[PDB]
């Protein structure tokens, strides 16, 4: 009696966590709390969906960006 509502809410969950994951960097930029905030919001978005190209592709990009938070460790924190 709510399987469709469950599915649409499961999909909306991916969007809403991904939106926090985007919006967070948009509202404050970057410090070391990004690693938890992004790995959470975008993997938590991924928790619902992988086959939705955009939703995973955006977390995969964010995994490249979490990679780049540690490239930035090598390039800046370890060398400034």
From Swiss-Prot:
It comes from the Eukaryota. 1D-myo-inositol hexakisphosphate binds at residue 15. Expressed in numerous tissues, with highest levels in testis. It is found in: Lysosome membrane; Endoplasmic reticulum membrane; Golgi apparatus membrane; Cell membrane. TPR repeats lie at residues 1-52. Autophosphorylates when part of mTORC1 or mTORC2. Phosphorylation in the kinase domain modulates the interactions of MTOR with RPTOR and AKT1S1/PRAS40 and leads to increased intrinsic mTORC1 kinase activity. Part of the mechanistic target of rapamycin complex 1 (mTORC1) which contains MTOR, MLST8 and RPTOR. The mTORC1 complex is a 1 Md obligate dimer of two stoichiometric heterotetramers with overall dimensions of 290 A x 210 A x 135 A. It has a rhomboid shape and a central cavity, the dimeric interfaces are formed by interlocking interactions between the two MTOR and the two RPTOR subunits. Belongs to the PI3/PI4-kinase family. Serine/threonine protein kinase which is a central regulator of cellular metabolism, growth and survival in response to hormones, growth factors, nutrients, energy and stress signals. MTOR directly or indirectly regulates the phosphorylation of at least 800 proteins. Functions as part of 2 structurally and functionally distinct signaling complexes mTORC1 and mTORC2 (mTOR complex 1 and 2). The kinase domain (PI3K/PI4K) is intrinsically active but has a highly restricted catalytic center. The FAT domain forms three discontinuous subdomains of alpha-helical TPR repeats plus a single subdomain of HEAT repeats. The four domains pack sequentially to form a C-shaped a-solenoid that clamps onto the kinase domain. It is linked to Smith-Kingsmore syndrome: An autosomal dominant syndrome characterized by intellectual disability, macrocephaly, seizures, umbilical hernia, and facial dysmorphic features. Focal cortical dysplasia 2: A form of focal cortical dysplasia, a malformation of cortical development that results in medically refractory epilepsy in the pediatric population and in adults. FCORD2 is a severe form, with onset usually in childhood, characterized by disrupted cortical lamination and specific cytological abnormalities. It is classified in 2 subtypes: type IIA characterized by dysmorphic neurons and lack of balloon cells; type IIB with dysmorphic neurons and balloon cells. This is Serine/threonine-protein kinase mTOR. The chain holds residues 1735 to 1814 of 2549 of the full protein.
């Amino acid at each position: 009696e709510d399987q469709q509502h469950k599915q649409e809410l499961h999909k909306l969950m991916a969007r809403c966590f991904l939106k926090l994951g985007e919006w967070q960097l948009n509202l404050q930029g970057i410090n070391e709390s990004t690693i938890p905030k992004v790995l959470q919001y975008y993997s938590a978005a991924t928790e619902h969906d992988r086959s939705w190209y955009k939703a995973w592709h955006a977390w995969a990009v964010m995994n490249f960006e979490a990679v780049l938070h540690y490239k930035h460790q090598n390039q800046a924190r370890d060398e400034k």
